[PDB]
């Protein structure tokens, strides 16, 4: 009801701006890579996939040549913001990951959702957490 799981279910996985569309899945992780909550649909990620993401936030652009993997699926890395946002694309779907002071906020989308909407959902939550000192 006020839990991390509620944050994911009600603030990441909500109907996007009344359009009738949703993210396919979402999660909130610590910057250390432990999951705080995820959606029932969030992919079966592996520990080294999460470490590579943590590395990409420390060494911007490391993944650009070879890709971002999550549950064995490859996303092509597109323009993000060093140490703060990682974006990726896979077909007409994608992924967006926003790092805060303490957390990383993941969003995964599939057509017809646009990358801008995923970015907007994940960044709105990420920015709120930063305001609460997280």
């Amino acid at each position: 009801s006020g839990s991390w799981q509620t944050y994911v279910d009600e603030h990441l996985m909500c109907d996007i701006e009344g359009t009738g569309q949703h993210l396919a899945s979402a999660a909130i992780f610590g910057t250390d890579g432990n999951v705080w909550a995820k959606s029932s649909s969030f992919p079966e990620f592996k520990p080294d996939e999460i470490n590579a993401i943590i590395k990409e936030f420390s060494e911007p652009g490391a993944l650009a040549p070879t890709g971002l993997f999550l549950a064995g699926a490859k996303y092509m890395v597109i323009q993000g913001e060093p140490g703060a946002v990682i974006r990726g694309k896979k077909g007409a779907g994608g992924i967006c990951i926003k790092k805060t002071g303490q957390a990383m906020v993941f969003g995964i989308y599939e057509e017809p959702v646009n990358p801008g909407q995923c970015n907007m959902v994940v960044e709105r939550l990420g920015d709120y957490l930063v305001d609460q000192g997280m």
Binding site: S3, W4, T6, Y7, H11, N34, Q132, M134
Partner: peptide
């Protein structure tokens, strides 16, 4: 994890 802060609007 830290405790969730109050959820936003």
């Amino acid at each position: 994890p830290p405790p969730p802060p109050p959820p936003p609007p």
